[PDB]
Amino acid sequence: SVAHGLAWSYYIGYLRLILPELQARIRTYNQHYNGAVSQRLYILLPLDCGVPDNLSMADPNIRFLDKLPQSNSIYELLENGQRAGTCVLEYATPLQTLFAMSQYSQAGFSREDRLEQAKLFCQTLEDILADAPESQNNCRLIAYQEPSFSLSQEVLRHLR
Amino acid sequence: MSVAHGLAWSYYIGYLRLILPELQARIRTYNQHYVSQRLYILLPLDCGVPDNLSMADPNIRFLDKLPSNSIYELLENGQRAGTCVLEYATPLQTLFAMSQYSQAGFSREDRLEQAKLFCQTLEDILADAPESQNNCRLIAYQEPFSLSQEVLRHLR
Ligand SMILES: CC(C)(C)c1ccc(N2C(=O)c3ccccc3[C@H](C(=O)O)[C@H]2c2ccc3c(c2)OCCO3)cc1Cl
Ligand SMILES: CC(C)(C)c1ccc(N2C(=O)c3ccccc3[C@H](C(=O)O)[C@H]2c2ccc3c(c2)OCCO3)cc1Cl
């Protein structure tokens, strides 16, 4: 099960390092500018493992606002043309290993196997975050399957 | 639940699969401009990856960047014994960091078992990728030591 290794590397090599300092970085950015960024990192977990080049390409209601200094991005979520939210948002990039594996014929890794590992990656990550207090309170995982679909709506639901 | 299977598949599919088919042309270009046609990957079974590769041995001196891979001159008794593209298997840093994170309940004995599994799984992956296995060499080692001598043995 490749998902156990992917979830442990994602946490130990990245989330464990950025989440304890994210609250101070968002507080600094909010103090700098008089509009306010929500205090957590929203992680997009598309269960299809499709990670685009730019997050803004997935929905025209997700506009790039700015980079959070000290590389994370802030986005404004739109609902009917109005600014419905502002947050630090990004994809769970280790999902790209599962997508690439599903296209590499020699791996013998089907789209059914890919969905099973994408789900296992999300479950293993939430098991890891359960034991890390400063990390579970500084991030929110947004797991989704596409059925017609609005990613900004999916994010907005979690924000509220 | 072994982390090594995920670490070896990501190392190959997200990095080696992309750089190894174009490495032979990059080394031939560099040689024409101004050696050794393979990527030598250091796999310390202790999972210790230093900040700079040159800190692990004074007989491993940085030569240049391959137009990010590094070229190094290996020394034996002060003389240039070899020139190759060398780098560590960076996913081993997950295993080392896991072994220092209390909540993981991942011992140094568990870490050695996963470092070995990572090399075995990566060799199994490279066996099925022809253009990748011909353009890369895995140097797995346990420190009891000369890293330059360990690399030089594989070069020959
Ligand atoms: C080719 C594409 C589609 C563009 C792609 C892009 C990124 C990834 N990665 C992952 O899945 C990943 C899985 C676990 C931990 C960290 C990561 C990285 C990440 O999350 O960015 C990254 C990655 C993989 C291997 C590496 C590496 C970085 O650094 C050098 C050594 O080997 C994979 C693919 Cl397939
Ligand atoms: C803190 C230190 C000691 C400095 C550290 C440094 C590097 C790693 N990585 C790995 O072990 C690794 C494992 C499998 C595939 C790719 C990699 C990367 C690599 O090989 O460089 C890298 C990594 C991990 C997670 C990531 C990521 C990159 O990109 C963003 C999303 O999550 C781990 C640690 Cl613990």
Numbering used by the authors:
A (entry chain A): 154 to 187, 192 to 227, 241 to 317, 322 to 334
B (entry chain B): 153 to 186, 194 to 226, 241 to 317, 323 to 334
The authors write:
STING is broadly implicated in various diseases, including cancer, autoimmune disorders, neurodegeneration, and rare monogenic diseases. In this work, we use an orthosteric STING activator and inhibitor from the same chemical series to discover that STING M271 is a critical residue for molecular activation. The M271CH3 NMR chemical shifts reveal a unique molecular signature for pharmacological or genetically driven activation and inhibition that is not able to be resolved by other biophysical methods. We show hydrophobic interaction in this region plays an important role in regulating STING activity.
Since orthosteric STING inhibition is poorly understood, we compared the STING bound between diABZI-i and THIQi, the only other orthosteric, chemically distinct STING inhibitor reported to date. Our findings show no significant differences in lid formation between these two structures, substantiating that beta sheet lid organization over the binding pocket is not required for orthosteric STING activation or inhibition. All apical wing distances calculated in this study are bookended by cGAMP-STING ( ~39 Å) and cdG-STING ( ~56 Å), indicating that apical wing shortening or lengthening is not predictive for STING activation. Both orthosteric STING inhibitors used in this study adopt similar splayed open conformations, suggesting an open conformation could be required for inhibition. THIQi (inhibitor) and ABZI (agonist)-bound STING155-341 led to the highest quality spectra and therefore were used for 1H-15N HSQC and 1H-13C HSQC resonance assignments (see “Methods” section for detailed description of backbone and sidechain assignments). Approximately 88% of the backbone amides and 85% of the methyls were assigned for THIQi-bound STING155-341, while 84% of the backbone amides and 60% of the methyls were assigned for ABZI-bound STING155-341. In the inactive state (i.e. apo and THIQi-bound STING), M271S forms sulfur-aromatic interactions with W161 and F279. M271CH3 sits directly in between the aromatic rings of W161 and F279, which leads to a large shielding effect caused by the aromatic ring current and consequent upfield shift. M271CH3 chemical shifts of THIQi-bound STING155-341 and THIQi-bound STING V155M155-341 remain in the upfield region in both spectra, indicating both STING155-341 and STING155-341 V155M adopt the inactive conformation in the presence of inhibitor. THIQi demonstrates partial rescue of the elevated IFN in this model (IC50 = 13 ± 4 μM, % inhibition = 54% ± 26%) with an inhibition potency within three-fold of the WT THP-1 cGAMP stimulation model.
